[PDB]
């Protein structure tokens, strides 16, 4: 088996990407945020509070025939920003892209947070992180990828996110048309259950390359590039007028400035994130201050390669016994 | 902008 699904950004500064997913019988197609930095398949449903659904498409589990309660079974997740969701759990059929997966645990939200309700292009989340992270109780479930993994051609899934355009999520195979050159795979540490790897340095614009090791996760779930303070600051001193602001809570630069490119290490390889991707547009509407896409990891305790650096490469998530992360240039 | 920080 295999399956390619089109992910299309929800915004004009690409700050999230939704991929359509079919749940039930017959099919209910909800648009889901594919998060490799969580491990929960949750959705906006019919059991979700009515003051808590704005304009989202809902998954009505009493009109899927493959749909059954997992009783006493209960979920509760919290994200890196505040972000909250929770309820009960169903078992049902999920296709992504044609790849069918049967009795997958679909967690059906009874409470969602304010910031999920504000968010009307996203109907729920699909976790593509490691399964020790799954939050269901008292019996822990697995992710799509882990429920499909055995039935797939190669146990792997690619991220190919576009800059201002849609992209693709492929399950089961490497599309060798989708990239330039070689893919460099590097070693992954699965111990905290993240797509966690080790970056071999950085370059800022045309400058010289720094051999330091940056431990990060691959998280398609995060918009921006969260790197340690020394690295991020070496960055922003190349852009004239950029400061750190304690009421925007991060690095801004005026909009008329030319953003130079960020280079990160993949083994002996180099993936250049062009100047253009790091500009997240003006802070408020009207403003001539613009939000930067390289921000400090200091206040979250972990470094994230988010959508800014991932949407610069073709990404292979090798879900083999000894998992690796592969980046190519595109 | 409305960035995303997808677990805790």
Contact A281 B4 (CB under 8 A): no
Query: Could you tell me whether strands A167-171 and A3-9 are parallel, antiparallel, or unpaired per DSSP bridges?
Result: antiparallel
Neighbour-count burial of A250, counting CB atoms closer than 10 A to its CB (0-12 exposed, 13-18 middle, 19+ buried): buried
List beta partners, residue A90.
A69, A106
What six digits make up the tokens of A144?
A: 């799509």
Cα end-to-end distance, chain B, whole Å: 22
What six digits make up the tokens of A219?
A: 């998280």
Q: Which residues contact A177 (CB under 8 A, 6 or more apart)?
A: none
**Method underlying the structure:** X-ray
Region at A310 (left for phi over 0; alpha for psi -120 to 50; beta for the rest): alpha
Resolution (A): 2.1
Domain ranges of chain A: 5-174, 175-330
Residue A223 forms contact with B (CB below 8 Å): yes
Surface of A (24-63) touching B: CB under 8 A: 33-40
DSSP letter string, A238-255: TSTT-EEETTTTEEEEET
Q: Whole-angstrom Cα distance, residue A27 to residue A227?
A: 41
A199 is catalytic: yes
Cα end-to-end distance, chain A, whole Å: 26
CB A310 within 8 A of CB A158: no
Nearest to A262 by CA among A216, A211, A309, A305: A309
For residue A206, give the DSSP letter.
S
Q: Whole-angstrom Cα distance, residue A278 to residue A269?
A: 21
Q: How far is A143 from chain B (nearest CA, A)?
A: 14
Surface of B (1-8) touching A: CB under 8 A: 1-8
Q: Which of A14, A15, A33, A35 is catalytic?
A: A35
What six digits make up the tokens of B5?
A: 């920080």
Q: Which residues contact A73 (CB under 8 A, 6 or more apart)?
A: A88, A89, A136, A137, A138, A139
Tell the residue number behind the tokens 């991060």, with chain if given: A250
A35 is catalytic: yes
Fold agreement between A5-174 and A175-330? yes
Chain B residues whose beta carbon lies within 8 Å of the beta carbon of residue A79? 5, 7-8
Surface of A (56-85) touching B: CB under 8 A: 77-81, 83
Nearest to A87 by CA among A53, A154, A135: A135
The CATH number of domain A5-174 is 2.40.70.10? yes
Q: Which residues contact A178 (CB under 8 A, 6 or more apart)?
A: A158, A160, A168, A314, A330
List beta partners, residue A279.
A292
Q: Which residues contact A208 (CB under 8 A, 6 or more apart)?
A: none
Give the Å distances, CA to CA, from A222 to A27, A45, A65, A205, A292: 29, 24, 35, 23, 14
Q: How far is A16 from chain B (nearest CA, A)?
A: 7
Mutate: best of B2, B4, B8, partner A, most A CBs <10 A: B4
Q: Quick one: how far is CA A287 from the chain centroid?
A: 28
Q: How far is B7 from chain A (nearest CA, A)?
A: 4
Nearest to A231 by CA among A292, A180, A295, A174: A295
Give the Å distances, CA to CA, from A124 to A4, A46, A66: 19, 13, 19
Q: Which of A64, A85, A199, A297 is catalytic?
A: A199
Assigned CATH topology for domain A175-330: Cathepsin D, subunit A; domain 1 (2.40.70)
Q: What is the side-by-side strand order in the sheet with A243-245?
A: A243-245, A250-254, A289-292, A279-282
Q: Quick one: how far is CA A201 from the chain centroid?
A: 22
Chain A residues whose beta carbon lies within 8 Å of the beta carbon of residue B2? 11, 15, 118
């Amino acid at each position: 088996s295999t399956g390619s699904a089109t992910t299309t950004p929800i915004d004009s500064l690409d700050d999230a990407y939704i991929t359509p997913v079919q749940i039930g019988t017959p099919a209910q197609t909800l648009n889901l945020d594919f998060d490799t930095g969580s491990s929960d398949l949750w959705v906006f449903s019919s059991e979700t509070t009515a003051s808590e659904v704005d304009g989202q498409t809902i998954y009505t589990p009493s009109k899927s025939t493959t749909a059954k309660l997992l009783s006493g079974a209960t979920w509760s997740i919290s994200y890196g920003d505040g972000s909250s969701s929770s309820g009960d759990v169903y078992t049902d059929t999920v296709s992504v892209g044609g790849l069918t997966v049967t009795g997958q645990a679909v967690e059906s939200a009874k409470k969602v947070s304010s910031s999920f309700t504000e968010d009307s292009t996203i109907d729920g989340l699909l976790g593509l992180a490691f399964s020790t992270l799954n939050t269901v109780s008292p019996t822990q479930q697995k992710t799509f990828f882990d429920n499909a993994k055995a039935s797939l051609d190669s146990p792997v899934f690619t991220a190919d996110l576009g800059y201002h355009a849609p992209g693709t999520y492929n399950f089961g195979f490497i599309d060798t048309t989708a990239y330039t050159g070689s893919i460099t795979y590097t070693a992954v540490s699965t111990k905290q259950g993240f797509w966690e790897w080790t970056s071999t340095g950085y370059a800022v614009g045309s400058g010289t390359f720094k051999s330091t090791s940056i431990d990060g996760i691959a998280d398609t779930g995060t918009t921006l590039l969260y790197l340690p303070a020394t690295v991020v600051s070496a960055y922003w001193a190349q852009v004239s007028g950029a400061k750190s602001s304690s009421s925007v809570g991060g690095y801004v630069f005026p909009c008329s400035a030319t953003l130079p490119s960020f280079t990160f290490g993949v083994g002996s390889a180099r993936i250049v994130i062009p100047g253009d991707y790091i500009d997240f547009g003006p802070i408020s509407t009207g403003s001539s201050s613009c939000f930067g896409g390289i921000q400090s990891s200091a206040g979250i305790g972990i470094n994230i390669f988010g959508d800014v650096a991932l949407k610069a490469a073709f990404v292979v998530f090798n879900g083999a016994t000894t998992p690796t992360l592969g980046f190519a240039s595109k | 902008p409305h960035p995303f920080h997808x677990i805790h």
